[PDB]
Ligand binder design. Structure first.
Ligand SMILES: NC(=O)C1=CN([C@@H]2O[C@H](COP(=O)(O)OP(=O)(O)OC[C@H]3O[C@@H](n4cnc5c(N)ncnc54)[C@H](OP(=O)(O)O)[C@@H]3O)[C@@H](O)[C@H]2O)C=CC1
Length: 338
């Protein structure tokens, strides 16, 4: 017996976290937006005895997790995954910022009140909350877990990218500020800060033409045409399966108490992804562009070093690499259209 609450459980990472949690025989209560969502989640796993679901139509509102904490006082672990990953933002602070910040409070306020036997808590943040624009481009720099993105609130408002990056920064700020501004904090907080999350969905069932994931970075490649220009993008990446695992080690492991945990397997550009696909998918070579080896040089010259040694030590397992992650992503999308 050992109960774990996971919010927004139909999400890309969360669904992996759920699979792995269930495989280690935890009891899992996931929250979902709708009744439809919930019943779909249970059917995907063929209704195990150790998996239930509660409905939180909006994780951000005041008291959003009030009923479930009171109805499930046996739980000890809270994994928070839900956050608007995109919208069509007409106003950053209304649509995006203040939700992330005043919403993260209305999760922790809910737990400080009614999460009585809750001991370990894990929030999913981002590498975008760690790295600053100027630093991330410094080839000579070394960004670690202590680094904070120094973006202003006024800067977060300029556009939706600054918006999203700002939401991550100010929301995780709020989460530590909470455990410092309250007295008998009965739980400990760990945080998972990934770069771009690649990898397959938990179930090939769920594949749609455009994946509501950062694996749309990859998918966008497959919608290119041979004579098309390759859209520039780059940064760190990590596999959804290692990210999900990290969330579990975050409360299983005691050294994880009060830790920011950087999740990053390596670095990519779009050339990296093209190369890997053309190389390993013969039924696609000649149906998308080229220019091989660009990445190596671009990465060496235009990106800092992510030093996540302290994170990779704490976690202690080995990561998927780019070839395998990209492969599993694409192999899954191919074998879904038919
Ligand atoms: N994905 C990446 O590459 C990166 C991810 N992150 C972090 O990863 C976390 C998980 O996103 P991911 O799982 O990666 O991809 P998803 O976008 O698939 O996760 C989205 C999930 O969050 C739920 N959700 C979002 N806002 C609300 C809300 N206001 N009320 C209720 N449910 C909500 C959705 O519910 P429904 O599906 O029912 O609408 C969905 O299940 C995010 O919090 C983000 O900060 C950080 C850096 C990069």
């Amino acid at each position: 017996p050992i109960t774990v609450i996971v919010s927004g459980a139909t999400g890309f990472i969360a669904q992996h976290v759920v699979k792995q949690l269930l495989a280690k025989n935890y009891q899992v209560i996931g929250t979902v937006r709708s009744t439809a969502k919930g019943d779909h989640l249970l059917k995907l796993f063929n209704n195990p005895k150790n998996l239930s679901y509660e409905i939180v139509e909006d994780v951000g509102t005041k008291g959003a997790f009030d009923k479930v904490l009171q109805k499930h006082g046996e739980a000890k672990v809270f994994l928070h995954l839900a956050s608007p990953f995109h919208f069509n933002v007409t106003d950053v602070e209304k649509e995006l910022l203040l939700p992330a910040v005043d919403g993260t409070k209305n999760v922790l306020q809910a737990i400080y009140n009614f999460g009585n036997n809750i001991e370990k808590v894990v929030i999913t943040s981002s590498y975008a909350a760690i790295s600053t624009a100027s630093k991330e481009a410094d080839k000579n720099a070394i960004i670690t877990e202590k680094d904070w993105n120094e973006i202003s609130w006024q800067d977060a408002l300029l556009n939706p990218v600054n918006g999203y990056r700002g939401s991550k920064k100010f929301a995780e700020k709020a989460a530590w500020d909470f455990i410092k501004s309250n007295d008998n904090v009965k739980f400990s907080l760990s945080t998972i800060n990934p770069s771009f999350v690649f990898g397959p969905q938990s179930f090939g069932s769920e594949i749609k033409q455009s994946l509501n994931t950062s694996s749309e970075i990859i998918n966008s490649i497959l919608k290119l045409k041979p004579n098309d220009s390759i859209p520039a993008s780059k940064g760190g990446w990590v596999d959804v399966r290692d990210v999900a695992k990290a969330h579990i080690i975050a409360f299983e492991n005691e050294d994880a108490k009060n830790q920011r945990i950087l999740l990053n397997s390596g670095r990519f550009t779009s050339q990296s992804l093209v190369d890997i696909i053309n190389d390993k998918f013969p039924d696609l070579k000649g149906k998308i562009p080229v220019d091989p080896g660009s990445d190596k040089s671009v990465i060496a010259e235009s990106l800092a070093t992510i030093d996540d040694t302290k994170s990779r030590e704490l976690l202690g397992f080995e990561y998927y690499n780019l070839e395998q992650s990209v492969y599993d992503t694409v192999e899954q999308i191919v074998n879904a259209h038919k």
